[PDB]
Structure 1
Amino acid sequence: PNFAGTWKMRSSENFDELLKALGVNAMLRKVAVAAASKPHVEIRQDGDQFYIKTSTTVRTTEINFKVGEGFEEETVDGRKCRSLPTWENENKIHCTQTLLEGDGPKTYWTRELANDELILTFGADDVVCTRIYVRE
C-alpha cells in the first residue's frame, strides 16, 4: 500500500501508561510525553523496503527495514532489540521485538494504513498505546 509521505499526529491514547509500564520514572515520562506530543514523521517506501524517520525534540529515530527481514532497532524507551516485521494484512505490518539485554516486557509495534490514516500501535504487556497519524 502507500505509507509513503510526511505524517502529523491526530490523537494518542495510552502513551504515559505505556512508558509507565516500560519502567520509565515520572521525572522522565513528563519529558517524553510532552515532546512525544508533537512528533513529525517521514516515511519512504519502496515495495517492502521502508525508511521511517520519527523526529521529536528530545529524540529522533530513523529505521530502515525490509518487511520479512529482521533488523536491530530500539524499543520505545530506548533499549536495544532485534525485531521481525511481517505483513499481517495487505496494509498492516506487525513487528515483534526481542531485547538483546536480558530482562523486560514483551514489546511489539504495528503500523497500519486505514484510509489515508496511519494507525500506529505499541504494545508492552496488556498495555496498548494507539497513536493515529494523518497526512500533513
Structure 2
Amino acid sequence: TRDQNGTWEMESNENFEGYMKALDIDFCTRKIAVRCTQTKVIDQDGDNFKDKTTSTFWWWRNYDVDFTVGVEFDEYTKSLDNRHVKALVTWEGDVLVCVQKGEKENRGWKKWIEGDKLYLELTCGDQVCRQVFKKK
C-alpha cells in the first residue's frame, strides 16, 4: 500500500553509522546522530509529498562538589578531564578562590557575586575561561 500519511516514530535503526560514514559525516556528528530519536511526519496530496523529519537527542549531567572553605579536599573532575586534584578554597575579599593542585599547572577557579550576576573564572595553564551566570 502506497498510503504513507501520518506521524511515524523510528523503532529500529540498522547500520546508520556505516551509511553516515559513506556520506563522510564527521565522527562527532555521527556519535550524536545514531543516538537521536527520529520522527517523520508525512503529508501526501496526490503526487505531492511533504516529509518533515525531526531528529532529537537530550543529554544531562550533574556535577556535585561539597566543601568547606579552608578544608582541602580531593576532587575528581568527572565533568571535565577526569583528573584527581587537591582543591583548596579560600576567600579573597568577597571572591571565592580555589587552587586545584595536580598534574596541570596554574589550575583553579574564582567565583564571586555582583547583584544578580555570578562570575566564574576557570584557569588552566595559559587559558582563562570566563563565565557569567544570572540569578533564576
What is the TM-score of this pair, normalised by structure 1? 0.51
- Could you tell me which residue of structure 1 aligns to residue 98 of structure 2? 95
Q: How does 1:46-57 map to 2 (within 5 A)?
A: 57=59
Runs ≥4 residues deviating over 6 A? none
**In structure 2, how many angstroms separate the alpha carbons of the residues matched to 1:134 and 1:74?**
27
Match of residue 73, structure 2, among 48, 71, 74: 71
Q: How far did residue 58 of structure 1 move?
A: 4.9
TM-score (norm. length: structure 2): 0.51
Give the aligned residue type for 2:86.
R
Distance, in Å, in 2 between the alignment partners of 1:121 and 1:79 is: 19
Mapping of residues 108-119 of structure 1, within 5 Å: 108-119=108-119
Name the SS of the counterpart of 1:94 in structure 2.
Answer: strand
Higher relative contact order (CA 8 A, sep 6+): 1
Unpaired runs of 5+ in structure 1?
Answer: 1-25, 32-56
Equivalenced residue count is: 80
C-alpha distance in 2 between matches for 1:114 and 1:78: 31
How far off is 1:60 after superposition?
Answer: 1.9
Q: Distance in 1 between matches of 2:128 and 2:99?
A: 14
For 1:126 and 1:114, locate their aligned partners in 2 and report how far apart those are by CA, in whole Å.
26
The answer to whether the 8 Å contact 2:104/2:125 transfers is no
Aligned-residue sequence identity (percent) comes to: 28
Larger Rg: 2
Residues in 2 aligned to 1:93 and 1:60: alpha-carbon distance in whole angstroms: 21
Native 8 Å contact 2:108 2:122 kept in 1: yes
Match of 1:131?
Answer: 131
TM-aligned CA distance change 1:73 to 1:108, over 3 Å: same
Alignment correspondent of 2:89? 85
Runs of at least 5 residues in structure 2 that lack an aligned partner in the other structure: 1-26, 33-58
3-state SS in 1 of match to 2:105: coil
What residue is the counterpart of 1:120 in the other structure? 120
